Amino acid sequence: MNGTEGPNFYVPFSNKTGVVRSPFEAPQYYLAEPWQFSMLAAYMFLLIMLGFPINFLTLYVTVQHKKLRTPLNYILLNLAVADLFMVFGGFTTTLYTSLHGYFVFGPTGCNLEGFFATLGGEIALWSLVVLAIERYVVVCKPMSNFRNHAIMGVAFTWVMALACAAPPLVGWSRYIPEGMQCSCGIDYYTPHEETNNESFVIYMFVVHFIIPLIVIFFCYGQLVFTVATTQKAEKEVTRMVIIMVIAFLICWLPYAGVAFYIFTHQGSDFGPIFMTIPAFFAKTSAVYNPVIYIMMNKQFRNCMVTTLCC
Amino acid sequence: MNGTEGPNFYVPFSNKTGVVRSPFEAPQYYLAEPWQFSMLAAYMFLLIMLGFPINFLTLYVTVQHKKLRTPLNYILLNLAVADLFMVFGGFTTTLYTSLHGYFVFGPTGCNLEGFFATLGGEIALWSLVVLAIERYVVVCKPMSGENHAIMGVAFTWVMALACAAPPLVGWSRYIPEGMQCSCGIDYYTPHEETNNESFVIYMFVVHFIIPLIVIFFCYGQLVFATTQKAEKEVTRMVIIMVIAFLICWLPYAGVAFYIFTHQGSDFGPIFMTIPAFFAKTSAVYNPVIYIMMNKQFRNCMVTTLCC
Amino acid sequence: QVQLVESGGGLVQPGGSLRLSCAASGFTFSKYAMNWVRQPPGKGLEWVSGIRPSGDNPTYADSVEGRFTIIRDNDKKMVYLQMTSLKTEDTAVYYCTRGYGTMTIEGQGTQVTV
Amino acid sequence: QVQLVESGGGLVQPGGSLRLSCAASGFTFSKYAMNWVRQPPGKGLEWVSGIRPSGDNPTYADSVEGRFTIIRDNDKKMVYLQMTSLKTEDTAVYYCTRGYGTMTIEGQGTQVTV
Ligand SMILES: *[C@@H]1O[C@H](CO)[C@@H](O[C@@H]2O[C@H](CO)[C@@H](O[C@@H]3O[C@H](CO[C@H]4O[C@H](CO)[C@@H](O)[C@H](O)[C@@H]4O)[C@@H](O)[C@H](O[C@H]4O[C@H](CO)[C@@H](O)[C@H](O)[C@@H]4O[C@@H]4O[C@H](CO)[C@@H](O)[C@H](O)[C@H]4NC(C)=O)[C@@H]3O)[C@H](O)[C@H]2NC(C)=O)[C@H](O)[C@H]1NC(C)=O
Ligand SMILES: *[C@@H]1O[C@H](CO)[C@@H](O[C@@H]2O[C@H](CO)[C@@H](O[C@@H]3O[C@H](CO[C@H]4O[C@H](CO)[C@@H](O)[C@H](O)[C@@H]4O)[C@@H](O)[C@H](O[C@H]4O[C@H](CO)[C@@H](O)[C@H](O)[C@@H]4O)[C@@H]3O)[C@H](O)[C@H]2NC(C)=O)[C@H](O)[C@H]1NC(C)=O
Ligand SMILES: *[C@@H]1O[C@H](CO)[C@@H](O[C@@H]2O[C@H](CO)[C@@H](O[C@@H]3O[C@H](CO)[C@@H](O)[C@H](O)[C@@H]3O)[C@H](O)[C@H]2NC(C)=O)[C@H](O)[C@H]1NC(C)=O
Numbered sequence: 001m002n003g004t005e006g007p008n009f010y011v012p013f014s015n016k017t018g019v020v021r022s023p024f025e026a027p028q029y030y031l032a033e034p035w036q037f038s039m040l041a042a043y044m045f046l047l048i049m050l051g052f053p054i055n056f057l058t059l060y061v062t063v064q065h066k067k068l069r070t071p072l073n074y075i076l077l078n079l080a081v082a083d084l085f086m087v088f089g090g091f092t093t094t095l096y097t098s099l100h101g102y103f104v105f106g107p108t109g110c111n112l113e114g115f116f117a118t119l120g121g122e123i124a125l126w127s128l129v130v131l132a133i134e135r136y137v138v139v140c141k142p143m144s145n146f147r148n149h150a151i152m153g154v155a156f157t158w159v160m161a162l163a164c165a166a167p168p169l170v171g172w173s174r175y176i177p178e179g180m181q182c183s184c185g186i187d188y189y190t191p192h193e194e195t196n197n198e199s200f201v202i203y204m205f206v207v208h209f210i211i212p213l214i215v216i217f218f219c220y221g222q223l224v225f226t227v228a229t230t231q232k233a234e235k236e237v238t239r240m241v242i243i244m245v246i247a248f249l250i251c252w253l254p255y256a257g258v259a260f261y262i263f264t265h266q267g268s269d270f271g272p273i274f275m276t277i278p279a280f281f282a283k284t285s286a287v288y289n290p291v292i293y294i295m296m297n298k299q300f301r302n303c304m305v306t307t308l309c310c
Numbered sequence: 311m312n313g314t315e316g317p318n319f320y321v322p323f324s325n326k327t328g329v330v331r332s333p334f335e336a337p338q339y340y341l342a343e344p345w346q347f348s349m350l351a352a353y354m355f356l357l358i359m360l361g362f363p364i365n366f367l368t369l370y371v372t373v374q375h376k377k378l379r380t381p382l383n384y385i386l387l388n389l390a391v392a393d394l395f396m397v398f399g400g401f402t403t404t405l406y407t408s409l410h411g412y413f414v415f416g417p418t419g420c421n422l423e424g425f426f427a428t429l430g431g432e433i434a435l436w437s438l439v440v441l442a443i444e445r446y447v448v449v450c451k452p453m454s455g456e457n458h459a460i461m462g463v464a465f466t467w468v469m470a471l472a473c474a475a476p477p478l479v480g481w482s483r484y485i486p487e488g489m490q491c492s493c494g495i496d497y498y499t500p501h502e503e504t505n506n507e508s509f510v511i512y513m514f515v516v517h518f519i520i521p522l523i524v525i526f527f528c529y530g531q532l533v534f535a536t537t538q539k540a541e542k543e544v545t546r547m548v549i550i551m552v553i554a555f556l557i558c559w560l561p562y563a564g565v566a567f568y569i570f571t572h573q574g575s576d577f578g579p580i581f582m583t584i585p586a587f588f589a590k591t592s593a594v595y596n597p598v599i600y601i602m603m604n605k606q607f608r609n610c611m612v613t614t615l616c617c
Numbered sequence: 618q619v620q621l622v623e624s625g626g627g628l629v630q631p632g633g634s635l636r637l638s639c640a641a642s643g644f645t646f647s648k649y650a651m652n653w654v655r656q657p658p659g660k661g662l663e664w665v666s667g668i669r670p671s672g673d674n675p676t677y678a679d680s681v682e683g684r685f686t687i688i689r690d691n692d693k694k695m696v697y698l699q700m701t702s703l704k705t706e707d708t709a710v711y712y713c714t715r716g717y718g719t720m721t722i723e724g725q726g727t728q729v730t731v
Numbered sequence: 732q733v734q735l736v737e738s739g740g741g742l743v744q745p746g747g748s749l750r751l752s753c754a755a756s757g758f759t760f761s762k763y764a765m766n767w768v769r770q771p772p773g774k775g776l777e778w779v780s781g782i783r784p785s786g787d788n789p790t791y792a793d794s795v796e797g798r799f800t801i802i803r804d805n806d807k808k809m810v811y812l813q814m815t816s817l818k819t820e821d822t823a824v825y826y827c828t829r830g831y832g833t834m835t836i837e838g839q840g841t842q843v844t845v
């Protein structure tokens with residue numbers, strides 16, 4: 001066989017040799033070199049290391065100031081929350097798993113890793129859907145005198161993200177160790193028809209990928225003929241919405257591509273490095289988002305220093 | 311049978327019940343409540359969490375700027391280095407050990423925890439000896455810059471390794487303290503063959519009393535324009551740096567003496583562990599002062615951050 | 618509700634032949650793969666053979682390389698293992714597992730005593 | 732170079748008496764404490780008794796509470812265990828350990844067969 005399927009897991013490595021074992025039992029050092037597992041932990045450490053401070057500052061500064069109550073700030077606080085949920089919920093588990101080289105926590109340990117990895121991306125995705133719609137309403141001016149509405153659109157992101165991330169935990173689809181058996185994600189590997197994860201992958205790529213991206217570029221297409229001082233501040237922040245997407249596309253496409261590749265070519269010959277590289281790469285979502293919010297948005301940066309330098 | 315001594319370890323808990331085990335084998339949840347071990351990890355996490363960013367920024371900003379080459383900045387960069395050695399060398403080990411509830415790494419794992427804990431304090435101590443002498447030379451003007459500072463910064467590492475290295479050499483030793491999560495010098499067992507009894511004298515003499523004398527000896531000299539205002543605030547920060555160091559390290563140093571005096575007495579695991587973990591704030595508080603009080607630095611920090 | 622039958626097998630001559638069966642029920646059969654795994658009286662399970670869902674490429678262990686052969690019927694939902702030129706060590710209880718794994722549904726299999 | 736002698740002990744009457752000895756050599760004796768620990772033929776070591784360096788407060792297990800008694804000589808470097816009103820289960824190999832622990836330095840021991 002090419003890969004080795006089990007009840008809980010699927011190891012992308014042939015069990016002709018006899019070496020293959022469950023990643024919920026023993027370490028998976030036969031997959032890749034043991035130093036590469038340490039390299040994961042090294043990488044995954046820095047995500048946790050720069051995760052909390054940047055997100056917690058972004059969380060604190062926004063709430064501390066009675067100002068900063070624009071739709072942009074609500075969403076980018078929502079991300080700062082979700083990014084901390086990623087760090088403490090997900091990254092912790094995968095950083096520990098990288099040390100041991102397997103999910104020593106267990107199948108439930110895998111769920112945590114995959115859950116907040118799925119939330120993080122979906123809450124980032126559905127937030128870019130909100131940001132896409134929000135600038136269409138103000139710039140193109142379809143609906144007049146229509147700017148608490150923001151908090152409703154921020155609750156939208158969590159409603160849709162849990163529509164994606166929760167069902168695996170419910171038992172429709174499932175989180176399963178990916179690549180080096182250190183991260184977790186949706187089962188693209190086994191058909192798992194009883195679990196029905198085949199149908200979920202359609203549901204996910206349709207409802208939680210294609211529809212979002214349509215709405216984004218549908219809104220982006222409106223401002224092709226389009227592109228006072230507040231509009232300059234609008235422009236830079238509307239430009240940041242583009243850069244926020246550009247980053248999101250660079251981040252999540254590779255993983256999403258490989259996820260489709262495996263779903264199409266189930267049972268094919270692919271190693272543990274195939275999926276793990278773009279998977280761990282996509283966990284930069286926790287850190288890059290606020291760095292833009294500081295970097296580009298001048299209004300925030302000023303207030304950040306105010307909080308730091310009291 | 312108040313405490314339970316072993317080859318590697320000493321557990322501050324009677325083995326009348328039969329429950330006591332090595333902290334290099336099994337978890338020590340019989341000592342304290344298992345949630346208290348999680349509370350350690352929680353506390354110890356935040357030391358690592360605020361450790362790297364504050365120290366790395368302080369390290370980066372100082373080196374990045376071609377300015378900031380005053381003796382103050384050399385020492386407070388030296389601390390920023392040692393504080394990162396604490397975080398990555400020591401705190402990592404004790405944060406992991408707090409999870410499992412015992413030194414799963416092993417006796418060598420204990421050495422790492424105790425080594426950088428000893429360096430951190432000694433490099434902070436001997437740095438305050440340097441700062442004490444440095445302001446005496448400028449203010450009181452007994453003897454009428456850059457190279458001299460780097461020599462006095464190398465002094466701190468020479469003396470700190472005189473304290474921290476010998477345990478690893480095998481004179482004295484690092485041994486799990488309190489909840490068996492941190493490590494430090496053996497104040498508990500006589501272990502005459504290791505000769506840790508004599509080390510404790512050596513340590514409290516050479517690596518505590520002599521430093522503190524030199525500090526207050528210099529402080530005693532200063533009992534009786536604008537550049538001097540900048541001198542004053544930075545010389546005031548030297549006082550605040552000591553004030554913090556005294557608040558930090560006295561409790562641990564006191565309990566260390568108490569146990570050394572009253573070896574084999576009745577004392578629980580919380581006795582030593584509280585002031586021990588409290589003294590690991592040395593990594594974080596030092597630079598916070600260097601930012602807080604020193605205006606000259608703060609400005610340059612924002613320059614680096616806000617490019 | 619899954620149900621794998623384990624028909625075919627019994628007492629056979631040393632160096633004889635035997636055709637095994639595995640009637641699958643209660644899942645989309647053609648949508649995934651099936652294997653054969655045996656239980657030697659002494660040591661742990663040996664992965665005998667395997668085959669893809671389409672059935673294009675079969676895979677065999679070195680132990681039974683060329684002697685055994687695997688083939689499946691998607692329409693009838695069956696998996697066969699034509700065993701030829703048998704040996705004493707081939708004596709085991711044969712199970713037909715799903716996916717690509719040694720995880721055996723049901724039990725009993727078929728005691729092929731050589 | 733440490734050397735703990737394990738003198739005293741042997742064959743004794745059920746409900747008899749016996750005085751044990753432990754001549755210490757090769758360390759600051761009064762600077763350390765000393766214990767007594769026995770090896771039952773079947774189960775693991777039992778911590779019998781212990782005493783402080785000064786010798787002020789001796790400590791005994793519930794097993795031998797009142798029957799046994801411990802005392803040490805700092806000048807001669809010796810530790811004694813006066814065992815009285817013995818039992819069948821007191822049959823064991825007795826070791827005198829250092830510190831406060833059941834860690835026994837290699838010793839002749841003393842097979843006290845009751
Ligand atoms: C990748 O591929 C490898 C290939 O080896 C595979 O490893 C094997 O995994 C299987 C699990 O499916 C293991 O099978 C079990 O082995 C048990 C014994 O294993 C130990 O002991 C043997 C010696 O006996 C050693 O050689 C070995 O190293 C182990 O230390 C065995 O007991 C199991 O079989 C019993 O239990 C099952 C389940 O209940 C039962 O169905 C069987 O009938 C059997 O019970 C028997 O019952 C009778 C009646 O009551 C009783 O009298 C008899 O004593 C029992 N039989 C025995 C043998 O005692 C089971 O076969 C297998 O050992 C692994 N191989 C190795 C090398 O150990 C990996 O799992 C694959 N990786 C993945 C995750 O895909
Ligand atoms: C705190 O106090 C407890 C009190 O029990 C100590 O626990 C005992 O530690 C001793 C240390 O030597 C153990 O002694 C050894 O036991 C072995 C067998 O133990 C297992 O098997 C028995 C049944 O046979 C079970 O009842 C038991 O639970 C264990 O699973 C023996 O094989 C050993 O004998 C060998 O070594 C000795 C060394 O002196 C030789 O003299 C012998 O000839 C032989 O080679 C040995 O006797 C004892 O088993 C432990 N008891 C328990 C709880 O199981 C703790 O160690 C102590 N803690 C600290 C930190 O000091
Ligand atoms: C492990 O995965 C590899 C792919 O990574 C599988 O190889 C594939 O095997 C099938 C069946 O033999 C090939 O399909 C056939 O290809 C030929 C030539 O292109 C074509 O004429 C036939 O009509 C048919 O489509 C497939 O091409 C091949 N893939 C490649 C490019 O190597 C392999 O079977 C897997 N191993 C097992 C047994 O799981």
Ligand SMILES: *[C@@H]1O[C@H](CO)[C@@H](O[C@@H]2O[C@H](CO)[C@@H](O)[C@H](O)[C@H]2NC(C)=O)[C@H](O)[C@H]1NC(C)=O
Nearest residue numbers: 311312313574575576577782783787788789790
């Ligand atoms: C455990 O330590 C306690 C002290 O913390 C010891 O108690 C002392 O015992 C001496 C006699 O040996 C008395 O003179 C003291 O007054 C006691 N101290 C107090 C105030 O409790 C105790 O003996 C120790 N246990 C052993 C057996 O070593």
